[PDB]
């Protein structure tokens with residue numbers, strides 16, 4: 414069934430599961446033509462496929478060539494997403510395949526379900542949560558690998574860096590969702606918070622700064638302030 | 651013109667014969683129905699006055715035998731039976747006609763309704779959907795479930811309609827996932843028409859039979875089947891032109907005949923709005939769209 418606030422701890426049990434977000438698969442800039450009409454130019458995108466328990470991120474880069482000569486691209490994007498997720502599952506050993514795939518947008522249910530007909534024991538589920546995974550292209554290293562791609566490419570990351578050595582996956586997911594919510598609500602401010610101090614670095618093999626436990630509390634506190642504010646600046650309160 | 655003799659009418663019952671119906675009182679001197687047109691299947695159906703629960707009835711074709719109705723007080727229903735003794739039957743019928751104990755199948759001469767509702771329905775195909783091979787006629791009632799319903803429980807008492815499922819390996823060619831899901835022509839023309847039904851007449855016959863069981867018995871699984879068979883054609887970009895023209899005629903007469911007060915349960919809003927306004931064939935059902943818009947504009 415649908416994933417919501419009530420069954421949130423299920424994300425961190427020992428049944429393998431993946432979130433799939435398709436927001437950033439088909440991306441365009443809209444511009445004027447010489448004749449004064451409007452046209453779109455596509456840019457590279459990505460499927461965001463995340464194991465919330467382990468932090469393993471399967472980032473399938475979608476190169477603009479996959480749209481050449483195709484119609485109804487927003488619709489095709491959902492089926493392309495489902496085809497790539499299906500290909501990913503088939504590439505994993507049986508004992509690594511997910512038992513559930515949770516899609517962040519309901520329009521992905523039927524495309525994924527049809528592509529996964531071969532896997533009747535994998536549950537395809539929606540969610541009621543408003544998860545901020547679109548903001549993954551606000552993470553600099555992830556954006557950089559997507560824009561530089563010259564061909565289809567899968568890139569593997571751990572979106573939690575080394576956090577699981579010190580915190581649980583519940584706490585790591587909550588940190589991730591807070592960082593991404595902040596980046597989505599006010600990217601510039603959020604990015605100021607994370608690196609305005611020049612002595613805290615991002616390791617070459619990591620995505621986020623090497624904060625101590627105490628600095629993470631400060632950082633997390635600053636992100637919640639941002640989110641509350643912008644919610645005022647937005648609604649005037 | 652043939653006759654179906656009733657042994658008696660011991661319980662008050664509304665009797666249907668095709669799209670006609672009449673009331674019979676407890677122990678009324680009623681001995682059957684005469685002047686039944688040859689050349690068509692027919693259905694004779696029952697709703698007891700005391701228990702509107704369970705509409706039930708029998709599909710039959712008088713060319714296949716001499717059939718009569720006799721009430722069974724143990725099982726509590728009117729049962730169809732075959733009389734194998736031809737001279738016994740003729741003598742039975744002639745006596746009741748002489749005593750004018752029978753109602754007349756009341757067909758208006760201009761009226762093609764029943765032909766138009768049963769054009770492609772054959773008894774031999776009914777008997778494969780309703781399996782009871784010791785009889786030449788077929789029992790159906792409001793509660794019988796379909797094979798597909800059982801998968802989602804008595805196999806002997808099921809409606810064995812052709813299983814249609816748009817998210818199934820039969821419907822979706824590996825590697826044509828998006829193509830086959832958004833344009834069901836493969837599934838309609840290759841899997842179902844060429845593979846399973848053999849021709850469109852058998853397809854239309856099952857569609858018509860499913861509608862009639864939905865209308866006369868309120869059979870929910872039959873209504874599901876009728877809508878699924880409509881949707882499979884409407885959701886196909888490539889349909890033979892003769893099939894579309896015949897479908898429009900079929901549906902038109904079904905909508906024409908439907909009780910105005912049953913449209914709330916017998917018509918699926920989603921299927922009809924999709925078929926008439928969003929599907930590949932949205933512009934191919936002129937007669938059906940005009941009668942639906944003038945008779946059930948609320949649904950849409």
Ligand SMILES: CN(C)C(=O)Oc1cccc(N)c1
Pocket residue numbers: 655656657718742
């Ligand atoms: C088989 N049916 C048609 C039948 O028994 O009809 C009659 C004939 C004779 C007596 C009575 N009771 C009814």
